[PDB]
Amino acid sequence: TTALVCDNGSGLVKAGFAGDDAPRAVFPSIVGRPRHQGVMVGMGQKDSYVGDEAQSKRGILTLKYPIEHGIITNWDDMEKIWHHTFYNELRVAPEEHPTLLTEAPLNPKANREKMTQIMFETFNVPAMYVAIQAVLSLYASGRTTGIVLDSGDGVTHNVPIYEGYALPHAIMRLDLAGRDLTDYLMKILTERGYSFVTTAEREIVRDIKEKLCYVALDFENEMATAASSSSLEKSYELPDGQVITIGNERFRCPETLFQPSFIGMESAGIHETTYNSIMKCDIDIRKDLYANNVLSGGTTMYPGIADRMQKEITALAPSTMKIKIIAPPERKYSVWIGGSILASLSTFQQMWISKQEYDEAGPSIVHRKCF
Amino acid sequence: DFDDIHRKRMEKDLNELQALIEAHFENRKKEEEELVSLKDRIERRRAERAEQQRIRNEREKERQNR
Amino acid sequence: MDAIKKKMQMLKLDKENALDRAEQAEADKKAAEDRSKQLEDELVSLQKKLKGTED
Amino acid sequence: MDAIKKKMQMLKLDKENALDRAEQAEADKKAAEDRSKQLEDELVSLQKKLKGTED
Ligand SMILES: Nc1ncnc2c1ncn2[C@@H]1O[C@H](COP(=O)(O)OP(=O)(O)O)[C@@H](O)[C@H]1O
Ligand SMILES: [Mg+2]
Incomplete structure (x- = not known):
């Protein structure tokens, strides 16, 4: 059967x-x-x-x-x-x-x-x-090596694998995920006047996050641009009317992934826990892991994350290695x-x-x- | 392994795009022009109904006015 | 719309693959030419050693 | 429309640029590789004549 x-x-x-x-x-x-x-x-x-x-x-x-x-x-x-x-x-x-x-x-x-x-x-x-x-x-990508960052909605974990042999001492599990981003977005929306409190309205904030938020390629430049022009303010219609306008909350909600200090978490972002997970591996399989970095999970669907993460890792990694980020369209x-x-x-x-x-x-x- | 990526990717890389373009073309052709023409037709019928209503209302008001 | 996004994604997959292949080929050229020039330098030193032996 | 045309043309241009650059790099790689092979072959004979000279 x-x-x-x-x-x-x-x-x-x-x-x-x-x-x-x-x-x-x-x-x-x-x-x-x-x-x-x-x-x-x-x-x-x-x-x-x-x-x-x-x-x-x-x-x-x-x-x-x-x-x-x-x-x-x-x-x-x-x-x-x-x-x-x-x-x-x-x-x-x-x-x-x-x-x-x-x-x-x-x-x-x-x-x-x-x-x-x-x-x-x-x-x-x-x-x-x-x-x-x-x-x-890692199966779905058709690979057999690579370090996969599976940023779900509950927990983000980063399992490196080489030639089919998993490395149990290099798994870096971090508890920041989509739910914390929803809560942080719901918390920063209050800076414009919109208050969502009920557990039912968390779903509305989740829909806002899915449809509007995006990851900025460079954070400071976006913060400066959104504070001068108004080309970013995208509006959205609640389930009853009364459209709302999201300003620089758009790229500040998913930025928490790369700076977990926003929600008070101590640890480093998803851009640096991947590099740390690689560096715990042996010295001879680091090139392959650098070249076959895999993204998965729902929360990695933000528009523009596969470029921000590559830029960050290229900044951290040695200049000679090639950094490639596999982001299949069927990520979810x-x-x-x-x-x-x-x-x-x-x-x-x-x-x-x-x-x-x-x-x-x-x-x-x-x-x-x-x- | 990694040899079925071609046979599952390259297929839809062209067939899916062409088929969706075909679907969009046929749907637009079926939908937009027919809808605009039908709305114009219904508008003409509505104007004729308006004329009939005006004539009947006026003749009844003419007779009934006492 | 719907099909337009998928077509853009295909055009982007081609972009990534072509760019990656170009970069890899460029790295290959750099490595191969460095190999060749180091071999040529070794040949030159051998010529000079042969000259000293001839003297 | 307007955006679709310009984006599609730019992306196809990017793909073509990467492809041609890769082809040029691979051609230079093959030529350098063959020249390196020539250098090896000549260097072996240079070593042989040096050994005879030393004897
Ligand atoms: N298109 C999208 N854009 C941004 N975020 C998304 C998108 N789709 C889903 N998400 C986020 O990802 C979560 C779903 O993740 P999912 O992969 O289903 O988790 P799980 O691993 O439990 O299945 C949702 O809660 C949502 O916050
Ligand atoms: Mg999951």
Whole structure:
């Protein structure tokens, strides 16, 4: 039979059968209970709208993501999300399909063990396998080397790989991602008068960020230009009218990636953690990693980031090496495409964690040889 | 490996562009001119309805005025 | 619109690939010519050593 | 329109410039490589005649 390549993510759940080009169903991972009282009788009001249904009734819900930073903080809601994904968005019972979840690097063990225990006890799948979210993004590019920066919505991690041999001592995981950029944008919009507070209006700020923000090639020059002319002010129409005008908030929101001091984080930007991740590698594979830097994940879709990052790394790196940044147009679904490719391989067909194996060793089987 | 990138990229590099250009051309041709012509036709019918309404309103006001 | 963006992306992929190939070829030329000129210098020193041996 | 034409023409110009530059570089690389081969071949014989002279 065919395998189910699910990809929990944090912000958008992407799923679909193995062997295709794009995920079959992509929908936000939010579960929102209603918060008001409700007076109409017999309206058929449910107790929790999940997935894309709660992005249409969000006016009277309190949306809450079940995955904070890679890790899962609310297991009941995550189980609800998985149940919805299997039964309503794909309509395939899990009793007859292997599953291939994905997990960020350096995550707590208990999260992974609970994930496999749920998949084997509640949904009762035949066999499931957990894979690191960066190796798949490297599969999708058709490479076999390279250092991949997978800046998702929950957590940004940077896994270097050479000739198929991952370097476990050079993984640099940073917890700045799309959600923190949304919060920072929502916080700097208040400087013009627009106040978004409700958890429903966070979605509106996210839409503003997606449609308007861009990464500046040079930050100081843009700050000077936006403060003199008015060629940058782009307007946007809220879900009820009252258009708003975003000035130099456009390139200040995604600039947080390269200067995490804006949101008070100490660490260095995504332009310098990649160079540090490279320098921890051996001295003989640094040229190949320099030449095959891969971008993935949703948050790396800002217009103009593949040039800013290249300029920064070229500034840091030695002058002789060639710096090349691979930015495929299908960046958002790169991890899932790689997952489909991996699940479609014949050599991989014996790596699944078969159910009888789980019955013999318990949920701690995932840390064992079947990784 | 890296030899299917050609056979999955170069294909859509030209076929997709040409097909989308064809789709845009046919959609514009089907849509814009027909819509403008139909709107003009409906406008002429609307003007004729306006004339009929004026005539009927005037004749009824003429008779009923007592 | 829709197709226009994709066509621009194709034109940009061609841009990146052509530019990268040009730069790599230029680096190859620099390296090869340096190799040749160092070999020529070695040949010159051998000629001078032959001259001393002849003396 | 206006923007599409100028951007497309400029990008195609960039691709053509990179391609021709790469071709020129590769031609010079091949010529330098062959000349280097000639230098090696002559240097070996220079060494042989030097060795005979020294004997
Ligand atoms: N076109 C876009 N431009 C800018 N940011 C985007 C765009 N699309 C998605 N994002 C950001 O990326 C996030 C989605 O990232 P995603 O790759 O789905 O995360 P995950 O790894 O959990 O799947 C969204 O929250 C949004 O903030
Ligand atoms: Mg991801």
